[PDB]
Design a protein around this ligand. Structure first.
Ligand SMILES: [Cl-]
Ligand SMILES: [Cl-]
Ligand SMILES: [Cl-]
Ligand SMILES: [Cl-]
Ligand SMILES: [Cl-]
Ligand SMILES: [Cl-]
Ligand SMILES: [Cl-]
Ligand SMILES: [Cl-]
Ligand SMILES: [Cl-]
Ligand SMILES: [Cl-]
Ligand SMILES: [Cl-]
Ligand SMILES: [Cl-]
Ligand SMILES: [Zn+2]
Ligand SMILES: [Zn+2]
Ligand SMILES: [Zn+2]
Ligand SMILES: [Zn+2]
Ligand SMILES: [Zn+2]
Ligand SMILES: [Zn+2]
Ligand SMILES: [Zn+2]
Ligand SMILES: [Zn+2]
Ligand SMILES: [Zn+2]
Ligand SMILES: [Zn+2]
Lengths: 153, 155, 155
């Protein structure tokens, strides 16, 4: 257990928290961004205010978060949750194992989901679409419409 | 590495797991709730069964989870994922950097999304709506309708 | 802090990382899968490429991730976020406290949400539906229709 006078803490062979208020726990775990936190062997939180939790996880974007083995978040404001998830667009969010949020301000929801269009939320990919269930009827213009509502027309 | 007979583990300058089965790792990391887990400098898992992971992350609600630097989950049953995400409503869920789910039983999906109505899931905020894609056609009454179904009705 | 020549790290009474590139931190924390990461007392990352973070969390599925106190991911490709969240279906994703993504290829979004139909995404459960808000109008056949669009047909 190695500590610094600037709030860094590390543990594991070759683990290095050098950014200030850093935490790096795991073999060759690295937290080089300010306010950065890395957990798992070869985890890498190099972005400022980044968080990389999971073996070979990586969060190199500013304000990025990658959680799950081999998860990646290279976009600024990008967040990836799930083993092998990638959030690579600016302000993107990938939630699901092997999900990919590639476009800016996009989200990909579910395992293997891909978001390749700006400002959109993807629940799968072409030929692998998912039904959205337990949706209460929409009220405002920008609420989703459910089947009971479509049928009422 | 400090350990107690009651399942607590602490590592870091001033790191303190004191709640029973606590784990606190990072400078001034604090796990004071029962079964609490805190990782990162100044991380604070103070709710019973809370989990705060990331620098300055905070999970003070009972059963709360905050993952991401500066993430916060002060609501009971609340879960926040993303840097600066905030799940402040009871049973709220905020998934995306700087997302906010303030209302009870709500969810905010995507960066900067705001959920301020109860029992609702927001995919953005007013003037910043997001489109929902790769949606299979709705089958049951409470499923979403897609554009293909809307077009077949416009006939 | 114990370390192996095969990249394992463990800290805590009875902590054990034995799979290769493993990390196990906390009282009786266990990381037995390859490339596995466990944080918290009794946390258990026994799947290959699994990640279990939170007191008593479990990720026993291959490539599974469980984050939150008592969160569970026994399914292959399963990801659970939130206290007591369970993603048990193959390729399922449970996001929210006490959410359950049970069916293969399903997702449960929101506290207490249940997904029991394959290839579907649930925002609640029967009699506990949630409104989806801040949805831009759909463009492609497989985009969700919003209310403005529905009303544009109604006339
Ligand atoms: Cl940066
Ligand atoms: Cl953007
Ligand atoms: Cl696609
Ligand atoms: Cl202790
Ligand atoms: Cl002891
Ligand atoms: Cl509490
Ligand atoms: Cl910021
Ligand atoms: Cl409510
Ligand atoms: Cl396995
Ligand atoms: Cl894989
Ligand atoms: Cl399926
Ligand atoms: Cl089309
Ligand atoms: Zn800061
Ligand atoms: Zn930020
Ligand atoms: Zn296929
Ligand atoms: Zn307990
Ligand atoms: Zn609970
Ligand atoms: Zn604006
Ligand atoms: Zn591997
Ligand atoms: Zn995988
Ligand atoms: Zn799978
Ligand atoms: Zn009920």
């Amino acid at each position: 257990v190695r500590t610094s006078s600037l709030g860094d803490t590390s543990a594991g062979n070759g683990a290095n928290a050098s950014g200030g208020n850093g935490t790096a726990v795991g073999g060759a775990a690295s937290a080089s961004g300010t306010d950065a936190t890395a957990l798992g062997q070869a985890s890498n939180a190099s972005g400022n205010h980044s968080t990389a939790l999971g073996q070979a996880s990586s969060a190199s974007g500013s304000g990025s978060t990658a959680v799950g083995q081999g998860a990646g978040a290279p976009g600024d404001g990008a967040s990836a949750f799930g083993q092998g998830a990638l959030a690579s667009g600016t302000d993107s969010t990938a939630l699901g194992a092997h999900s990919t949020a590639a476009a800016p301000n996009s989200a990909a929801i579910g395992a293997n989901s891909v978001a390749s269009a700006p400002n959109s939320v993807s629940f799968g990919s072409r030929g692998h679409e998912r039904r959205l269930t337990n949706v209460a009827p929409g009220i405002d213009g920008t609420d989703a419409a459910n089947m009971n509502q479509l049928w009422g027309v």
